[PDB]
Amino acid sequence: IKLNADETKTTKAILKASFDMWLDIVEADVVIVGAGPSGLTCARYLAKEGFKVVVLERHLAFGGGTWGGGMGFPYIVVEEPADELLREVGIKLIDMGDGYYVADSVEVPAKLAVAAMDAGAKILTGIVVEDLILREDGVAGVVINSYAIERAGLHIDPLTIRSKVVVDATGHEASIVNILVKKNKLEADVPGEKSMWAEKGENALLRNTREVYPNLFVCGMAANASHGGYRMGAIFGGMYLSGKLCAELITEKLK
Amino acid sequence: MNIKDIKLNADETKTTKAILKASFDMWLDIVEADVVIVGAGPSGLTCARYLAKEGFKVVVLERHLAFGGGTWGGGMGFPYIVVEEPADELLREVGIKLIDMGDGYYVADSVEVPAKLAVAAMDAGAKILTGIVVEDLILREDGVAGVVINSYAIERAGLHIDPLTIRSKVVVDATGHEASIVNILVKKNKLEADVPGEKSMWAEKGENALLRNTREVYPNLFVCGMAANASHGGYRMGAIFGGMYLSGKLCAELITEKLK
Amino acid sequence: IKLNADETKTTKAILKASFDMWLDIVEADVVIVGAGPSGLTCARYLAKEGFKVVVLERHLAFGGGTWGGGMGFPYIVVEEPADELLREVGIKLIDMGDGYYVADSVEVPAKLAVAAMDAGAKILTGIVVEDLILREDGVAGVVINSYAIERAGLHIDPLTIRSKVVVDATGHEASIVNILVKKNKLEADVPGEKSMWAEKGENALLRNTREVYPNLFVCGMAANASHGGYRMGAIFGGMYLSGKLCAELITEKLKN
Amino acid sequence: LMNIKDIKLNADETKTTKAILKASFDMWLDIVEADVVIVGAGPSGLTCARYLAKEGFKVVVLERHLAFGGGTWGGGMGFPYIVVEEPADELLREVGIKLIDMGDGYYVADSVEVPAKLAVAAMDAGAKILTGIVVEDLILREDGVAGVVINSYAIERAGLHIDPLTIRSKVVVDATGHEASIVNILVKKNKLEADVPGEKSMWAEKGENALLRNTREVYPNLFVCGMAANASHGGYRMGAIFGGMYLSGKLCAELITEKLKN
Amino acid sequence: LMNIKDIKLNADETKTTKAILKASFDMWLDIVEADVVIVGAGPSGLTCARYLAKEGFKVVVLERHLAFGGGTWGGGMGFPYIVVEEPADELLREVGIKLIDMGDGYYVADSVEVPAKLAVAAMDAGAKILTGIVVEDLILREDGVAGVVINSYAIERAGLHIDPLTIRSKVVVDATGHEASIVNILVKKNKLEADVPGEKSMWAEKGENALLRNTREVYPNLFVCGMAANASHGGYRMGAIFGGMYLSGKLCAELITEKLKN
Amino acid sequence: IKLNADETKTTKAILKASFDMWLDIVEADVVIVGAGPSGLTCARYLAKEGFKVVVLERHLAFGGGTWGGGMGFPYIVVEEPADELLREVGIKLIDMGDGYYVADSVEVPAKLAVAAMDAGAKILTGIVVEDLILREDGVAGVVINSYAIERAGLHIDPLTIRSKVVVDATGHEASIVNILVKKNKLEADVPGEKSMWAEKGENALLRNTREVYPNLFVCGMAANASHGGYRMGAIFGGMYLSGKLCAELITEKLKN
């Protein structure tokens, strides 16, 4: 095989493509912060509904804290009936009894990401949300920068993405909600997660998945961190449901 | 039934035991395999796809917690990678959307690619283990007999802890420009041979050498992707991946032949 | 000598045994956090009593802050009558007068660990307790991860060990009691150790060794740190007695 | 016969501090001359130390880390069991270590139990173990190696420029694992024409069996055992199987006993 | 006599090692009880130490770094001179330090000469200086402060979990500079209802004069001098001018002498 | 007491005096690199002889590796007859027998430094020698920078000090001799110190203290490092004698 490869043609193709993408993407319907299990589920459902969705993830790879499974052991758990949310995306499960299923902790994030992308959602990695955009209305988008710039420690201004809604799906950090409260000196505490009580934790998640400030929703562990809910460890049924519920709430508000 | 109105039954011990139990059946099974591929990059995952379709038992080992290698960042952070005719079929094959940029050049979302390559590999039967470092090789008189493994966490943490092993009929170095498995072989076993490393950039010379350079370099040890060019002093090509995909496929064909 | 050694047989033996240990260990009667002198003493006494005991230690080696003795000088001190707690485990002592004895600071942790293990206690090193498990009842176990993962800085979920009781034997850090208070936003301060007053410190230890929250006990310096007690330096009599007392208190609560 | 909570304990800062000083001071003045210095409190070094001390020699084991044990604790990739094969399993049994039979002459042992019990055996046999102590160099005479140059691990980690002290000995043993760090010091600093090749890749059988052949006096008064032996002679490695380590240590003690009773 | 090159020197490892060990132990066993402990071998602490030792007290100065001197060496922003103003210049002259007159009662001195000569004066007056030694805590009695809890700088930097030793004293002096680290320990660990405010911004005149007022016993048996005094009382700072530092140290010695001859 | 202290007057005095020192110091007779025991002894003797001497030291404090004594134990050893080199500077010694004396490891560097400074030598600390100055003649001085700049990792050009002679007294590093050889691609190896043999080591020091390249002398451990000599540990007699000898050799070469 003769392959025709040229530096300039390669460079320009990347540049050209990246530009059409960037100019288009800086206005969107929904921005999801965090490409974890809850954020990617939310993204799936919103995109199926025809919304223009961007998922932003600080690390170069999506996935959040799924890859390592439980203490390095590469399986994660899902309980009935949230297992359907995995089946529905082609993820193979193993039945371990009593409504408990496991899945390869590398297979899960891959297939959740593909579902999201194939549903229409855009995922940008290597991108840090450092702040929010505000209007009198409430939250109006996100202020973004490059992970590389952040790690490198450089003093460089950001860019923006305007959106109708922002979703904090950043895990136990609840880092977008914290930014809102700290920088805008709101009289409210983000308490953070309590200790482990899997049952209390999993069930609180759905109650705690809501709009916490105008145009700002939380899902996944960010929801329990924001409302002082218990944690559940390497069981993900509530994560997936929270993401879906979050998409339903947003769909309602936005139609 | 309403999604707000769901009772979830979640228990710490049941969760912990399920993960332990499943990890064990996996581990006890996986430590003997037909082929071990080192590196979950574009070449290694392509190779894994083809070998698994052929019914071989394949393990891909990757140091980082996420697969993908150096695809995610695309070109200098700009999140698209290039593929040239006819290697674009190797992407289409796997559901990856391409944009035609002219002259047989296509781009693809640099996040979409590694995801879809990984899914293909896994759906073809290949097992991918991340967070796992190959620190050494296993030898027999025959030649290479498998890999010596440890955890990334242990490595980063700097702890002095012994490894485990995976025996295989074949090992593939798909570790990129590092060519780290070939280097280990040469350095530790004091072989009279130099791993020269990649030359400077000449995309055309580089892309075409890749296929010539994708071969068995020592008994039971194959190289593909940039590891092939690094091992043979070939030029590099930058963020164009047609040769990577073809190298991976070729590497699978060579191994299939040897192993049938 | 011809030795028959094989990679796969070696690997599978390790995996098989570990896998068996793990499935069994994630439910236990008592979890002791910290393989220091107090935690290992507690572990000895509870295991003699037939309880199923796991000691968890973040570092790969047990021992806590015994090894370096005093400012690097490799001897630690024990005072009458706590010296019996060392002799009973085979530790050689040197009489320095006035009811003071010293012991080789390397010999001590080794022999405390052996006693615990031989009494039935299991010691897992390289393991960090990052959180607690709760029920309405009170503390229900511990949330664990690997030291390697922690040092490496990786974002990886934990596993669990359920237990009837948890013991904070983590030294002056009192890190388990702190986790409880901080994360569950309890209205209470963990004051931390006061300055050195060896006599006040040694004697307070026994008063301070107790159940501080349902199913959570403290012993060793964690006890004084939790109750704002004085410290005593490289003298360990109270540490050993605290561990023993802590085992007695737990035995009482748990035998039924 | 009382509530433990009531016991009156007499504890005093000065008495505590002086007891530690006094005892360390006696220990140090005595220890700086010895028959054998073993560098590395790993499985091979501690085994060696057991056997030499039983024989009545004055033995010091030096270990850089605060805890003894070497790379035993983490077992295999974190999984806390190590393997031993027939007949080296007796070297564990004899020290009270419980073994589980896994078949085909393979036994496992709790990776935390092993180093503890090896250390206790050594100490109870008479050996002295000093942790937190780095060997940074050797002492020489025309005769050959004459002891070790020592410093504190704390000082080393802290990066401070501080002179060392010494321990004179008739023999030195490099039991420092794959580093073979004492042999390397000898060669590098004294510009000897010889290469320390380092370990080859894994071949457990070739590796385990070479260990016994490779356990020897490599330079006058300097022995190697454990992985240091295979590293020094370009031998293969064997992973988390320790039968050869234990035998190497024992063999090393036999070779030294022979040389020194002469 | 001869060309130096031909001198026969008798040097032996063991004799060297045992001499150091022997002398250190006599020193350590003696030093762990003292009249006064000064924390910080800076300009104020070393001055204080001079005056207390001249008075016949048994004084130990403890310094974390291997070298004494505090923040004198670098002078002002690296420029190696420090300033002293009339009449505190006599406190330098009296110790042999050469001064250059810059006018208006301002003198400079070589920033390397000063710490050296202050240290020599202290040592020659009888004071003992131990470097490489960190004070991590205080010793208490109902009476008040009863000494210091000490550890090795090496151990601290290395990050090791190792217990300390102690030095009992009638008085402790915090001469640790703007950190006021001993006073802070007292307050933080013993949960005293009092704030250590720390130094204010620069106002050299207000700062220099407050120092003498602020040099006092702040808790029973605990004195402050030097910048620790201003840090403890929220006083202004003065920069690279040291007259008040020297006077503070001297005043501190006078206050202590008074208390202790009672 | 009313003290008159002013920021500007303070700042200007420091600046004024420093600039005067700097403009004068950048030409000197002898530059000694390393304020250790050998370098400071050499400096004493050269300055007594009327030469203009600068000692340069990277760390903010002088002293080299004296302060910590032996493995932290704060005493260093000196053997007959080199003990006179310490008594002559006011250092108190303790007789430990057989011609061995010890001295407080903090007292020694202080008093060596004072002697040097009082003899006329200038000591500049916080100053790194990063390179040499050359002429056809041979070595012509040193290229200097600030320790702070080096540690901070900043890319900043240096300044210079011209001298008739340069002395490498940088200890076992022998860092100035190494710079010469590496950067100027001389066909010669700096072997570095051998292992410990105190007697061989101490005696070789005097033979090894010499001019190794035109205008470049070595003393102290740098001498043994340069010539592959054995080391001797915390015994300093040879260090002191090496420094003195080095001053004698330089005096001879330089008096005319």
Ligand SMILES: Nc1ncnc2c1ncn2[C@@H]1O[C@H](COP(=O)(O)OP(=O)(O)OC[C@@H](O)[C@@H](O)C(=O)CO)[C@@H](O)[C@H]1O
């Ligand atoms: N400011 C930010 N900008 C961009 N990405 C961010 C930012 N902050 C966090 N992230 C990224 O957001 C993602 C969060 O994924 P993560 O997986 O932590 O969130 P989740 O979807 O709620 O699931 C939590 C579970 O993994 C597990 O912990 C659990 O069940 C609790 O016991 C991760 O991939 C982060 O790197």
Ligand SMILES: Nc1ncnc2c1ncn2[C@@H]1O[C@H](COP(=O)(O)OP(=O)(O)OC[C@@H](O)[C@@H](O)C(=O)CO)[C@@H](O)[C@H]1O
């Ligand atoms: N010892 C090891 N153990 C496990 N994984 C390893 C080891 N060494 C390397 N890897 C892993 O190997 C993976 C794949 O590497 P990588 O993605 O570099 O290899 P590739 O498939 O040939 O692709 C090369 C292109 O990305 C690009 O560079 C190019 O076109 C040349 O100009 C990366 O994800 C590494 O983390």
Ligand SMILES: Nc1ncnc2c1ncn2[C@@H]1O[C@H](COP(=O)(O)OP(=O)(O)OC[C@@H](O)[C@@H](O)C(=O)CO)[C@@H](O)[C@H]1O
């Ligand atoms: N979160 C955690 N998970 C696991 N291990 C932990 C955790 N936190 C601490 N540890 C481990 O707990 C152990 C504490 O042992 P440590 O020896 O500090 O505790 P102790 O038994 O009360 O004895 C204290 C004395 O050493 C000394 O301080 C004294 O006499 C007072 O002046 C050490 O070995 C830690 O590594």
Ligand SMILES: Nc1ncnc2c1ncn2[C@@H]1O[C@H](COP(=O)(O)OP(=O)(O)OC[C@@H](O)[C@@H](O)C(=O)CO)[C@@H](O)[C@H]1O
């Ligand atoms: N210069 C030094 N001074 C003091 N201790 C030292 C020095 N250099 C190394 N050590 C210490 O020496 C000890 C060596 O113990 P290590 O366990 O490495 O040596 P070993 O006895 O031969 O056993 C090797 C096995 O762990 C395993 O790896 C195997 O079977 C091969 O695949 C460790 O505890 C080091 O910290």
Ligand SMILES: Nc1ncnc2c1ncn2[C@@H]1O[C@H](COP(=O)(O)OP(=O)(O)OC[C@@H](O)[C@@H](O)C(=O)CO)[C@@H](O)[C@H]1O
């Ligand atoms: N816990 C501790 N243990 C031992 N030494 C300590 C401790 N904490 C601090 N030190 C040491 O104490 C010494 C304090 O010396 P320092 O020089 O800081 O104190 P000073 O005597 O008041 O003089 C201050 C002036 O240098 C100057 O800055 C000024 O005029 C204000 O603008 C320094 O050498 C520290 O390293």
Ligand SMILES: Nc1ncnc2c1ncn2[C@@H]1O[C@H](COP(=O)(O)OP(=O)(O)OC[C@@H](O)[C@@H](O)C(=O)CO)[C@@H](O)[C@H]1O
């Ligand atoms: N490039 C440089 N620029 C400036 N200073 C330097 C440079 N390189 C080294 N130094 C400084 O030079 C000084 C060397 O003093 P050092 O004390 O190492 O040298 P010495 O005077 O020969 O005495 C050696 C003994 O301490 C010890 O080694 C021994 O007897 C064991 O065999 C130290 O104070 C360094 O900081």
